[PDB]
Subunit: 334 residues, 4 copies
Amino acid sequence: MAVKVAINGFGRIGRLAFRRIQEVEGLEVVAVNDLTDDDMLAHLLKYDTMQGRFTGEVEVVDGGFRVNGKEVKSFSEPDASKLPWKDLNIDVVLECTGFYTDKDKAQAHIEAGAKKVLISAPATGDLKTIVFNTNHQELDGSETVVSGASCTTNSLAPVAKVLNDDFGLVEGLMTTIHAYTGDQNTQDAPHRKGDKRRARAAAENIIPNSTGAAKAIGKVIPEIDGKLDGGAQRVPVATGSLTELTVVLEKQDVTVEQVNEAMKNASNESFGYTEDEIVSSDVVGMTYGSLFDATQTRVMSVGDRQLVKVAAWYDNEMSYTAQLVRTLAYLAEL
Amino acid sequence: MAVKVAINGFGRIGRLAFRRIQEVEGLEVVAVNDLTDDDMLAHLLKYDTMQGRFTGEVEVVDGGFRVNGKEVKSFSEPDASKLPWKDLNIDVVLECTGFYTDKDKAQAHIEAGAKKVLISAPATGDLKTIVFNTNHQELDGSETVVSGASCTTNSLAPVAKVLNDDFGLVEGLMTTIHAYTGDQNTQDAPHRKGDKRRARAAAENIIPNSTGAAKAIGKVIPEIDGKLDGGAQRVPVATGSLTELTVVLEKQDVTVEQVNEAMKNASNESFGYTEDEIVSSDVVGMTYGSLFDATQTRVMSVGDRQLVKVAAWYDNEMSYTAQLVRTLAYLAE
Amino acid sequence: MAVKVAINGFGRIGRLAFRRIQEVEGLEVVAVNDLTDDDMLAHLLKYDTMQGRFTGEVEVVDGGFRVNGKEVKSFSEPDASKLPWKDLNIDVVLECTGFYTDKDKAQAHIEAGAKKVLISAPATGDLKTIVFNTNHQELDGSETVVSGASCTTNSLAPVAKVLNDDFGLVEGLMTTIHAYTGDQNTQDAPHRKGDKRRARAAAENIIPNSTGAAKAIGKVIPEIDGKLDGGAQRVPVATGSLTELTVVLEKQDVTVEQVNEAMKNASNESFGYTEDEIVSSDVVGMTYGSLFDATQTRVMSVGDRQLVKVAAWYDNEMSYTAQLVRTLAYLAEL
Amino acid sequence: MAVKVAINGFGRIGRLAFRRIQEVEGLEVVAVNDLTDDDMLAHLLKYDTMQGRFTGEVEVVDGGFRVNGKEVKSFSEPDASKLPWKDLNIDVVLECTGFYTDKDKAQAHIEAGAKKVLISAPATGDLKTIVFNTNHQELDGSETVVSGASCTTNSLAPVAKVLNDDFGLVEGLMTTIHAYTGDQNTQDAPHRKGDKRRARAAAENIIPNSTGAAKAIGKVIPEIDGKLDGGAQRVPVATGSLTELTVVLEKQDVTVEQVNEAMKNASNESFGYTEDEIVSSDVVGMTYGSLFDATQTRVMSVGDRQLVKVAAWYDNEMSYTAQLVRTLAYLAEL
């Protein structure tokens, strides 16, 4: 009766989703797929630079690894259509490799025998893009393939919803000052996808780049589709990020206190509120999808014309992972 | 011979200005004031983490130090009314300590005997704020105390001038993604000026903060005074920064190409233009005050309403320092 | 009910000592002295870059802050002799400012009314230097001023004791590859004490420097006084360090396994043992004073002549802090 | 005679060697092989995080790119035996990919038409390993495949030669405090070669690891083969490294000044001497293979028994690259 989860891709999100599922009753990881040996998988689960030691016991066994007494099967299969998801009774696959970010591509898990697939990134094709606590109620239970959107999209959506519901959004630009990620290079080097900026030493530069929220957002809140755009500056922190959003609103006698009060009223398990002068390392490990920071709200007025600026923090690892596990549990509950 | 400069405060900008002054045959630093021994001064001139080795020879000598032959006198003065600027015939003081950022305070150097003071920061009082090649022609030669604005103001001004001249600036917000500076703390610790974010480990955080450019720009371009505002995110690079400006313009069928071409046409020794996908470290050591990056121009349109975003790089160290030494030579000319 | 502790200097060690004491019943902090406002003290207690959020509630009041209702009085006093230790019944002062690291200087707290002072650094004068679980039993309860040695000394002492006790230590050199500390500069800048290397950007360099362990260790283990020396390389991690010790021993058919087994047999609350291939961030927040790493033991032999090398990890923040709080509790229990 | 050079692998060393070569008469790169597009190759040559900007104009043309008006042909060939080295009259290939580090494997370039191959790494098989100005005079001009040793071996050789020639080396242990390299991971992630430590976030950890120097010195100075060993601590600087050697010598009334003076007497283009209290960033871009630092010499004496410690800096990028280009020009001059 526990929901049976398989994780394809045991990278940052895969491993972090495994950690969260250990704490969510009714969800169990029964299988992991990754192109590496089990000694490596167990070790990276156990030790984690930014997120901390895993509490429980992890041991490598012949067909997998035991975690707190439970067996986790590990496979090493690179065509996802060959995975034994049918023999193992998989309810949901968390698709975290980065190589199946499309509806038709992802159906390989479904051919293989899983009941549903949640992609841990924006994805192309005929599927719903879901930010828990913003549009998860769009899910009616008939879905086989779903996108969990991106980390930034998750930090943005509940802020952008309040702005548009309460004040009316005319248009806005976004910058996420964003931690470096695994697909950035350690040293100046040819990048795989030809990105001359992701080619550069990750932890020695401010590096302009694209953000997966720039397009994902309109799919999440359709009534502002086309009204927001922006990008990222990848900077030398290993996790922890900040979304700055600069907007023109319909209402035009808006104040700092009006904006702050409205965000607070919308706060919930996915959307936090803070008036403390925190910095990025202070959100490491947090499980809100977004943390609105009242100390950063700015309102600029020249005659009848206002620009409004807001900021929301997120652990681009754990915020995103917690959002994705919330979607997982909900997707499996109907 | 030569304009005689005295540098008060031998920190990042003071040392870099000395260094910049070594690149400018005919400018000479005849004196340095700082509260530290000469062995420490010479050493810090000689070795530089982000800016690299001083190639010329530096040696410590009885009254101060010898640089590539020339004697530079050094002092351990805590005040600047007691400095022997009169005996040494100082033409201009570069005021880089951060403790004299006001017209009345800075007149101490003038009482001491210097002819002019250029402050390496925004400053209060009855003085002109000057970003070279934006508003340096406001100087008529009667000034005794002048401000060189800030590093961010120097990155912002030529971009904002083009935007307002060409398209008409209604309003705008700014964020500088900015290298950490020496007044930030190494580890989480009490901060001197009470700033709970500058109190935090500089090289382990994204840290929101204030910017000079926020207040200094209206003084540089009066016709947009009050139309811009913004701040900073201090991030873990030791030098190199990026100014992002998000604006509403009067003209409202503006394009990416229109904006880019206009910046290009305005390029000069202080304002560079690039279409290369560079990153921060790529502007370490550069001498433009501002480097416009065409790859980053965005234009957002919903019906008749447009938001325009632009970005410009700067070495908050050498960009600023090079701007300040241009002003210094013009001020003395 | 409780030993009453005053912390002088609310820096890295002071603040961390405050947090450890919340986990150890019998200790309470009743006072903090530092040259900064309360809002800054509460904030830095609450938020910590490398050690994570303070779990409990922290609120500011005038002349202090409260922590879970418990009132903590705060002060601004540069000469320790004017502090109201007498009015507050202070049992032990943790001296963490760095400005009283001498027996006569530290007696200021004693003049002020505290019963005892534990200095969170090596210290000159007529005092004992203590590494918990190496030489704390030297304390007979008559001491008024005591040194808690340094973070490196605390990593080194139990390793050096085993080497000497089991094999006979002839001589040895030490390097600690050491996290940068708050008295290093952010940017190349004049250094307060005239150290041309501590003058340099802390997080952009490998920086040779002194360690407190070279002089403090002979005071901790007298029978090897003068037999060890060495220094540090300050590197760009914010906390987490590693001591490498290269020794000549009396016994000269020593093996990797003999060394390892001897460290394991000596392991305790202050001295851990690991065979896992960990890295520095893995010891962040650890409460051992030293963590011996068996994977780094080396024995070099040419004819009848052996060089032996060993390594021990420590969180130069929390290892040292945990050691110091152990000494504090023992000092007050005598 | 412009010696015609082909570079296989346009990574850190490959790109840096192209840069050195442009500063040295007699050698010219006419071809580059790498598995990436030319726009990427030109960009990474042009911009460089740690070494600064290439002086000179670089433009992308057809069969490669233009540097200072000179055409450089580029290829994207994975099968090297297929490279048109014969049609292009290649004198020497600089093998910098990391995939041909063996004599038999490297002969592929020779089958392809190149006259000689210099491998930019230690290498197995029947070949000479060369540190310029230590053992380059072993080259008699009949060699087709040669190894240029490693960056650390280059830092170590001239120091060890002086110690052995002047004092007699008994035995010694080494640690290189070493900049992170491009085969380390940006984030905790499965490592390609299964190294659980190189798997970890490069710029957030002190990471123990192996050094090529331990395997490569004995081949460079045969009379001390087997007498040295040691490893590395990879730390969060992007370039700039330090080798610490702890030795037992035959002569045993050795002094700090004796050791220092002997290093200084041996100093040359490859082997610099300093008495300044420098740090890692101060060697960035330097062209000495090794820079002996007199400020770090230590001598430890207990009765008749001495341990001597020394340290030499090196830019693991540019020191190594300058050493490699000196060997290249000598190899081609015989």
